[PDB]
Amino acid sequence: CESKCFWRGGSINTRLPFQNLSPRTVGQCPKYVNRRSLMLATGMRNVPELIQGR
Amino acid sequence: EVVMTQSPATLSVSPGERATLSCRASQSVSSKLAWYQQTPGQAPRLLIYGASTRATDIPARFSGSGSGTEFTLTISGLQSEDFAVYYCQQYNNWPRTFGQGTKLEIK
Amino acid sequence: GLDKICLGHHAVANGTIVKTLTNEQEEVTNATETVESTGINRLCMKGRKHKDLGNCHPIGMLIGTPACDLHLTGMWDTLIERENAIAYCYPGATVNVEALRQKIMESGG
Amino acid sequence: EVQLLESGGGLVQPGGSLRLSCVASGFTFSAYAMSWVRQAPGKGLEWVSSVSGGGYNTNYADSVRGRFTASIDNSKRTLYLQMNSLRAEDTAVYYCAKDRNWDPPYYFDSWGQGTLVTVSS
Amino acid sequence: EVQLLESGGGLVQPGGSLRLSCVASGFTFSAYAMSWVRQAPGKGLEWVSSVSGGGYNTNYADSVRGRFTASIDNSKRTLYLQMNSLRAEDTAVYYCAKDRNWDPPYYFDSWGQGTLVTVSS
Amino acid sequence: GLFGAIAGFLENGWEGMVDGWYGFRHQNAQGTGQAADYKSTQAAIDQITGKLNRLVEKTNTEFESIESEFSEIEHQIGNVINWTKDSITDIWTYQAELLVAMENQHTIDMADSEMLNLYERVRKQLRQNAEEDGKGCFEIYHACDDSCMESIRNNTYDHSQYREEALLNRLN
Amino acid sequence: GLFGAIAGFLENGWEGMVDGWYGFRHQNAQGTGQAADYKSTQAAIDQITGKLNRLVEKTNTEFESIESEFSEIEHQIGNVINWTKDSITDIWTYQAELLVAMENQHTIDMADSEMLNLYERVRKQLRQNAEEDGKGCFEIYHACDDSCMESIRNNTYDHSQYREEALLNRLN
Amino acid sequence: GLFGAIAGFLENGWEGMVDGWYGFRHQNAQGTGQAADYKSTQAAIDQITGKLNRLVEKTNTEFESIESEFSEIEHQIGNVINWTKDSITDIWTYQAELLVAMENQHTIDMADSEMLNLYERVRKQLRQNAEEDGKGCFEIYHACDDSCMESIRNNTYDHSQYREEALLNRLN
Ligand SMILES: *[C@@H]1O[C@H](CO)[C@@H](O[C@@H]2O[C@H](CO)[C@@H](O[C@@H]3O[C@H](CO)[C@@H](O)[C@H](O)[C@@H]3O)[C@H](O)[C@H]2NC(C)=O)[C@H](O)[C@H]1NC(C)=O
Ligand SMILES: *[C@@H]1O[C@H](CO)[C@@H](O[C@@H]2O[C@H](CO)[C@@H](O[C@@H]3O[C@H](CO)[C@@H](O)[C@H](O)[C@@H]3O)[C@H](O)[C@H]2NC(C)=O)[C@H](O)[C@H]1NC(C)=O
Ligand SMILES: *[C@@H]1O[C@H](CO)[C@@H](O[C@@H]2O[C@H](CO)[C@@H](O[C@@H]3O[C@H](CO)[C@@H](O)[C@H](O)[C@@H]3O)[C@H](O)[C@H]2NC(C)=O)[C@H](O)[C@H]1NC(C)=O
Ligand SMILES: *[C@@H]1O[C@H](CO)[C@@H](O)[C@H](O)[C@H]1NC(C)=O
Ligand SMILES: *[C@@H]1O[C@H](CO)[C@@H](O)[C@H](O)[C@H]1NC(C)=O
Ligand SMILES: *[C@@H]1O[C@H](CO)[C@@H](O)[C@H](O)[C@H]1NC(C)=O
Ligand SMILES: *[C@@H]1O[C@H](CO)[C@@H](O)[C@H](O)[C@H]1NC(C)=O
Ligand SMILES: *[C@@H]1O[C@H](CO)[C@@H](O)[C@H](O)[C@H]1NC(C)=O
Ligand SMILES: *[C@@H]1O[C@H](CO)[C@@H](O)[C@H](O)[C@H]1NC(C)=O
C-alpha cells in the first residue's frame, strides 16, 4: 500500500479537501476542520410537486 | 423485438459460496437492462438498474457488469435466504419483453 | 386542447439539507460531504525504504542500547517509532533531549 | 412509506370479464407512470400494459391488443383494466407496479400484493 | 501570423487601366477595414482610398475622385482597385494595408510587399 | 381534475425525469412526450461537478511534527504551542465553513440563471407566434404535431413559414 | 407641473412609505392610494435581517492567557508570541473587513433581483392588456377603479374577462 | 456571402473597436457607422479598474525580524517558529488565490449584467415600433435614418411621432 500522510491510529489516505480524524498529522495530510460534517452542494434547489384534485 | 436467453436455465450452489449468473441479448441494449428477484407465492423485487447500479435496499454483496449484449451478476456470498427466481428485462425497445427466467436452488 | 410546449428542471422526491448565506437549511437535489471521517488502520508503506524500530527508542540508536543492537547503521526516508520504547538500560536522561530527538527523526540515515 | 394495494380476483367464463382495481398512496400520483404485469402459473413474466404522461398515452402487448383497455383516474388515484373476450389462456396472477419515469415507463420499481384470476369450463 | 501578398503590377499608356489585387490571411477579413496607399519615386506618401463597414462605404482622395473605384469580396478575402483614365502622374508604388478600426479607418497597422506601376509613350 | 397537470417551472419542478437536468415536454392531439437538452446540460454539469477538486489546491507544502505524542514537555513552551494551534484551527474552521456556505450560494444562483437564459432563447425564436402563459409556459397558436415541435428544440425553427397563420388567431 | 409625480423605480425610490419594502401605487379617476406586498416583504426581511447572527458562529473555544499583565518574561520568547499575535490579528482584520464588504455586495445585488422578479410577474399577469411605460410602471388600457385594481395585487386577476376590451384600444 | 456581417452580441463580440466598451452600430441606405455609450462606459470602467487598490489595505503594521539571517539559533524553538510561518504562508497563499478567483467571477458576472440592462432599456424606448431579432439586435419598421438614429442613442426618442407608421407594417 502507498500513502503520503499518517497519524496516530493509522493512515488518512484519501482525496478530499478536509479531514476530521485528528488535529495532529505529519506529511501532506489535509487541513483539519473542527466540525462533524460540511455538505457541499452539487445540484440545484428542489421544489417537489403538489396534488391537484379541485 | 428483443428476445433474451438466461443461461443456465437452472443452477445450484451450496450455502456461503459465490454465485454468478448471466443473461444474453439478441441485439445491442447499451446498459438499458434491469434485474429482478422474486420468491414463489410473493411479489418481485427490483435489484439492479443501469446494469451496474444497485437499487435502494440492496446489500453490498450484489454487483455486476456488462455492456452491449452480455451481462454478468455475481452474488458474493449466498446466504440462507438468497435463493429465489431471478429475471432479466430490457427497456430499450417495445415490447419490454421478459424471458425464460431462472431458479436458484441449494446444492 | 391548444398545442403547448414549455420548460423546467428536474426535481426529486426527498432531498438533502445544505447550508447557504441566506438560509441555515436549504433543499437541493443532491449533495456530497467534503469531510473524510474514516481511515485505514494500517501504516501504508509501499515504495518507501521504511525502517521499523520496534522496541528501539530513536535516542538509543545513537548510543547502542541492547534493544537497538541489531541495527545502528542504515539508510531510509521514513523512521518508525513505537510506544514505550526502551531507551536506557542504565537509567538516565539527556539535556535538551527534545532537540536531539527531533533531529534524528528528520535525518535521512 | 410507499404502499400499493389491489383487489378484484375471481372466477370467470368465456365472454365475461373482470374489472381489476389497484390503489396508490404515499407518493404524487400524477408524477409517475403505472403498469400492469402478469405471471402464468410457474412460468415466465409477461408485459401487458402501461400508462404514460398522466393518462394521455397508452400501450399494450401484442398478445392482448384490442382486447384489453387501460385507463387512469388521478382524482381517486385508481388504476383500471377493462378486460374483454377472455379465452382461458390468460389465467394468471396480476400485479400493479410503479416505475421511475414519465413518458417512457423505463423499469418498474415497486410492486403490490396482486390478485388471482382463473377460468374454467 | 499575418501576411498580405499583392500582385498586378504592369505598364500602361494613357487611357488604359490595371486591376490590382491584394490577398489577406491570418485574421478575420470582415473584422477590420482596408486601404490603398501609394508612393511616387522619391517623394512623400499620399492617401488614395479606403473601404469601411464591411464594404458598404468607401472614400477617395481629392486627386483621384471619380477616376478610381474600390471594392471588396469576402468570399475570397480579396481587395480590388479598378483604375481608369491613368496619366503619367500615376507612376508610383502601391500598397495594401490593414488598419485597426471599423467605421473610420483611423490609422493603418500592417503593410504588404507592394507593386510597381509605370506609364510610357 | 381527471388527468395530471402539465405545467413547468415557476410552479414546481419535474419529478419523473432522469435523463438530464434541463429539458422540456410538449402536448398536442398526437400525444405527450419528454426530452432533455444535452448541450446545456453538459455545460452545466461540467462546471458544477468539478468544484470539489478546485477546493483541494495542490500547494504541496509538507509539515513535520512539533508535538511529541509520548510527551515529557515543559509547561510554558507547551502553552505557547497550544495557543497558536487552536487559533489557526479556529481560523480554518471559520474559513472553511464560510467558504462552503458561500460557494453554495453561487451554485444555486448560477444554475437558476442558466435556466432563465434558455427560457429567454425560446421566446425570441417563437417571436410573435406564441403568447406567454405565465407559468414558465408557452401557448403555440399554430398547429405543430411532431416534427415542427422537434425543430424548436433544434434551433432550425424558421418562424417565417408559420407567421401568417399564427398571427391570425392571437387577435382574431 | 402642478401636481406631484407618480413614477416608480428606474427613476427613484418611494420617499414616503413605512409599511413594507416592496409596494404598489395605483391611480385613476377615483383617487390615489398605496399598498405593501406583505408576502414578498416577509420573505426578504427574514433572509436579510438574520445575517448578523450567522456571522457569530458558536464553535466555542476556551482560550486562556499566555502573557502576564503584571509582566516579566524574556526577550526571545516574548518576541515570538508578539509576532504571531499581530499576524493573526492582521489576518482577522483583513478577513473580517473583506467578508463584510463582499457580503454587502450580495445583499444589494440580491435585493435588486427580487424587485425585478415581482415586476416580471405583473406583466405576465396582464398578458396583452398593458404596455410598458419605461419608468417602472404599466399603462392599463381598460377601466378599473378599485376592485379590478385590488385583484391584480391578489393574483385573482382573470385576464380573460378584459382581453376583448383592452386589445381594441392598444391598436385602435 | 459577399459583404461582412452586422450581428451583435449573443453571437460574438465586436472585433474592431477602440473607443469604449459598450456601444452599438447601425445600418440603413445612407451607410454604416459606429458609436460608444460614454456614460455607461465611464461607470463600468470606474467601478472595475479601481479593484486593484482596494486589495492593498493600509492597515499598516511595523513587523520586525525574529530570525537571524546570520543564524546560530537553537533547534527546538527554531522548529516552533518554522511551523507557524508555513501555516500562515499556506493560509495567505490559500486565502489569496480564492479571493482573486472569487472576485473574477463577480467581474465577469457583473459586467454581463450591465450589458443586458442597457439592452433592456432600448426595447422599452422603442415600445411597439421595433421587433426583436433574436441575435441581440432589433428590426426597426419605419424609415428612421440619421438624426433619428442619433436620438435613440440620446434618450430624446419620442416614439409617439412614429407609432402610427411603424405599427402599420409589423402586421400589415
Ligand atoms: C450527485 O452528486 C454527486 C457528486 O457530484 C454525483 O455523483 C458522482 O457521479 C459521478 C458520475 O457517475 C461519479 O463518478 C466520477 O465522477 C466524477 C465526475 O466529475 C469524475 O471524477 C469521474 O469521471 C467519475 O465519473 C462520482 O464518483 C460520483 N460521486 C459520488 C460522491 O457519488 C451524482 O452524479 C449526482 N447526481 C446527479 C443526478 O447528478
Ligand atoms: C434596521 O436594522 C435594524 C437592526 O437589524 C432593525 O431593527 C431590528 O429589526 C429586526 C427585524 O427587522 C428585529 O427583530 C429581529 O429580527 C430578526 C429576524 O430574523 C431576528 O434576529 C430576531 O428574531 C428578531 O425578531 C430586531 O429586534 C430589531 N432591533 C435590533 C436588532 O436591535 C431595524 O428595523 C431596521 N430598520 C429598517 C427601516 O428596516
Ligand atoms: C487593461 O488594464 C490596464 C491595467 O489596469 C489598463 O491600464 C490602466 O488604465 C487605468 C484607467 O483605465 C489607468 O488609470 C487608473 O484608473 C483607475 C480609475 O478608477 C484607478 O485604478 C487609478 O486611479 C488610475 O487612474 C491606469 O494607470 C492604467 N494602468 C496601466 C498599467 O496602464 C488598460 O487601459 C486596460 N486596457 C484595456 C481595457 O484595453
Ligand atoms: C496543551 O494541549 C495538550 C493537548 O490537548 C494538553 O494535553 C496539554 O495539557 C495542554 N497544555 C500544555 C501542554 O501545557
Ligand atoms: C437539427 O439541425 C441541424 C442543423 O445542422 C440538422 O443537421 C439536423 O438534421 C436537425 N435535426 C435534428 C433532429 O437534430
Ligand atoms: C510585545 O508587544 C507589547 C505591546 O503589544 C509590548 O509592550 C512588549 O514590550 C512587546 N514585547 C517585546 C518587544 O519583547
Ligand atoms: C384574494 O384572493 C383570495 C384567494 O383565496 C380570496 O380569498 C380573497 O378574498 C381575495 N381578496 C380580495 C380582497 O379580493
Ligand atoms: C527552518 O527552516 C529553514 C528554511 O526555511 C531551515 O534553514 C532551518 O534549518 C529550519 N530550522 C529548523 C529545522 O530547526
Ligand atoms: C441630444 O440631447 C441633448 C439634450 O440636451 C440635446 O441638446 C442635443 O441636441 C441632442 N443631440 C445631440 C446630437 O447632441
Side-chain angles (χ1 to χ4, degrees), chain A residues 24, chain F residues 67 71 73-83, chain G residues 64:
Chain A
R24 295 141 180 227
Chain F
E67 282 190 279
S71 100
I73 317 307
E74 289 54 59
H75 197 27
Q76 176 169 4
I77 200 163
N79 279 13
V80 183
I81 298 159
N82 272 6
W83 190 93
Chain G
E64 61 199 357

Short mmCIF file of all heavy atoms in Angstrom, two decimals, chain A residues 24, chain F residues 67 71 73-83, chain G residues 64, ligand 4:
data_model
loop_
_atom_site.label_atom_id
_atom_site.label_comp_id
_atom_site.label_asym_id
_atom_site.label_seq_id
_atom_site.Cartn_x
_atom_site.Cartn_y
_atom_site.Cartn_z
N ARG A 24 -3.52 16.47 14.79
CA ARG A 24 -2.09 16.28 14.63
C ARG A 24 -1.83 15.32 13.48
O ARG A 24 -2.38 14.21 13.45
CB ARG A 24 -1.47 15.73 15.91
CG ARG A 24 -1.53 16.67 17.10
CD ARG A 24 -1.83 15.91 18.38
NE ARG A 24 -1.90 16.79 19.54
CZ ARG A 24 -1.30 16.58 20.70
NH1 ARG A 24 -0.55 15.50 20.91
NH2 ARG A 24 -1.44 17.47 21.68
N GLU F 67 4.98 18.26 18.11
CA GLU F 67 4.43 17.78 19.37
C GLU F 67 4.79 16.31 19.53
O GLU F 67 4.52 15.49 18.64
CB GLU F 67 2.91 17.95 19.40
CG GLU F 67 2.46 19.37 19.69
CD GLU F 67 0.97 19.46 19.97
OE1 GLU F 67 0.19 19.49 19.00
OE2 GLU F 67 0.59 19.51 21.16
N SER F 71 4.88 12.31 25.40
CA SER F 71 5.37 13.65 25.69
C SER F 71 5.95 13.75 27.10
O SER F 71 5.51 13.08 28.04
CB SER F 71 4.22 14.64 25.47
OG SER F 71 3.59 15.02 26.67
N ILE F 73 7.01 17.23 27.98
CA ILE F 73 7.32 18.62 27.61
C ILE F 73 7.33 19.54 28.82
O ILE F 73 6.86 19.17 29.91
CB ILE F 73 6.31 19.14 26.56
CG1 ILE F 73 6.02 18.10 25.48
CG2 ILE F 73 6.84 20.41 25.91
CD1 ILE F 73 7.25 17.54 24.79
N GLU F 74 7.88 20.74 28.64
CA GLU F 74 7.80 21.83 29.61
C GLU F 74 6.36 22.34 29.70
O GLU F 74 5.47 21.82 29.01
CB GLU F 74 8.72 23.00 29.23
CG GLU F 74 10.22 22.75 29.39
CD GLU F 74 10.70 21.51 28.66
OE1 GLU F 74 10.53 21.45 27.42
OE2 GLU F 74 11.24 20.60 29.32
N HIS F 75 6.12 23.36 30.52
CA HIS F 75 4.78 23.92 30.68
C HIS F 75 4.58 25.29 30.05
O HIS F 75 3.43 25.67 29.80
CB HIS F 75 4.40 24.01 32.16
CG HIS F 75 2.93 24.18 32.40
ND1 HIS F 75 1.97 23.74 31.52
CD2 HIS F 75 2.26 24.76 33.43
CE1 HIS F 75 0.77 24.03 31.99
NE2 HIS F 75 0.92 24.65 33.14
N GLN F 76 5.65 26.06 29.79
CA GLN F 76 5.49 27.35 29.14
C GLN F 76 5.43 27.21 27.63
O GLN F 76 4.44 27.60 27.00
CB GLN F 76 6.63 28.30 29.53
CG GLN F 76 6.58 29.64 28.82
CD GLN F 76 7.55 30.65 29.40
OE1 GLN F 76 8.32 30.34 30.31
NE2 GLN F 76 7.52 31.87 28.87
N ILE F 77 6.48 26.65 27.02
CA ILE F 77 6.50 26.50 25.57
C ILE F 77 5.35 25.62 25.10
O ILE F 77 4.86 25.79 23.98
CB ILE F 77 7.87 25.94 25.12
CG1 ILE F 77 8.09 26.24 23.64
CG2 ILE F 77 7.95 24.45 25.38
CD1 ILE F 77 9.54 26.10 23.20
N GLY F 78 4.91 24.68 25.93
CA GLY F 78 3.76 23.88 25.60
C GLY F 78 2.51 24.73 25.47
O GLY F 78 1.71 24.53 24.55
N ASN F 79 2.34 25.68 26.39
CA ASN F 79 1.19 26.57 26.32
C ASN F 79 1.25 27.47 25.10
O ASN F 79 0.22 27.74 24.47
CB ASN F 79 1.10 27.42 27.60
CG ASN F 79 0.45 26.67 28.74
OD1 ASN F 79 0.27 25.46 28.69
ND2 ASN F 79 0.10 27.40 29.80
N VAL F 80 2.45 27.96 24.74
CA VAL F 80 2.58 28.80 23.56
C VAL F 80 2.20 28.03 22.31
O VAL F 80 1.48 28.55 21.44
CB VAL F 80 4.01 29.36 23.47
CG1 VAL F 80 4.13 30.31 22.28
CG2 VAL F 80 4.40 30.07 24.76
N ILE F 81 2.67 26.79 22.19
CA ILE F 81 2.31 25.98 21.03
C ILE F 81 0.83 25.65 21.03
O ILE F 81 0.20 25.58 19.97
CB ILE F 81 3.17 24.70 21.00
CG1 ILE F 81 4.65 25.05 20.86
CG2 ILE F 81 2.73 23.80 19.85
CD1 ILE F 81 5.58 23.95 21.32
N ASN F 82 0.24 25.43 22.21
CA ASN F 82 -1.19 25.13 22.28
C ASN F 82 -2.04 26.30 21.80
O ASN F 82 -3.03 26.10 21.09
CB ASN F 82 -1.57 24.77 23.72
CG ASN F 82 -1.41 23.29 24.02
OD1 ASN F 82 -0.91 22.53 23.19
ND2 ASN F 82 -1.84 22.88 25.20
N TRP F 83 -1.66 27.53 22.16
CA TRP F 83 -2.48 28.69 21.82
C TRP F 83 -2.59 28.87 20.31
O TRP F 83 -3.68 29.08 19.78
CB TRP F 83 -1.91 29.94 22.48
CG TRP F 83 -2.81 31.14 22.38
CD1 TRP F 83 -3.73 31.54 23.30
CD2 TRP F 83 -2.88 32.08 21.30
NE1 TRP F 83 -4.37 32.68 22.86
CE2 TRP F 83 -3.86 33.03 21.64
CE3 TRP F 83 -2.20 32.21 20.08
CZ2 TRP F 83 -4.19 34.09 20.80
CZ3 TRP F 83 -2.53 33.27 19.26
CH2 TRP F 83 -3.51 34.20 19.62
N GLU G 64 -7.18 30.77 26.88
CA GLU G 64 -6.61 31.11 28.17
C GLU G 64 -5.39 32.00 27.97
O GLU G 64 -4.76 31.99 26.91
CB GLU G 64 -6.23 29.86 28.97
CG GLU G 64 -5.19 28.98 28.30
CD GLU G 64 -5.18 27.57 28.85
OE1 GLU G 64 -5.94 27.29 29.80
OE2 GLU G 64 -4.41 26.73 28.33
C1 LIG I 4 -1.74 21.50 25.59
O1 LIG I 4 -2.64 20.70 24.86
C2 LIG I 4 -2.47 19.32 25.10
C3 LIG I 4 -3.34 18.56 24.11
O2 LIG I 4 -4.69 18.89 24.33
C4 LIG I 4 -2.80 19.01 26.56
O3 LIG I 4 -2.57 17.65 26.87
C5 LIG I 4 -1.90 19.84 27.47
O4 LIG I 4 -2.25 19.70 28.82
C6 LIG I 4 -2.01 21.32 27.09
N1 LIG I 4 -1.16 22.14 27.91
C7 LIG I 4 0.19 22.11 28.00
C8 LIG I 4 0.90 21.09 27.13
O5 LIG I 4 0.82 22.85 28.73
#
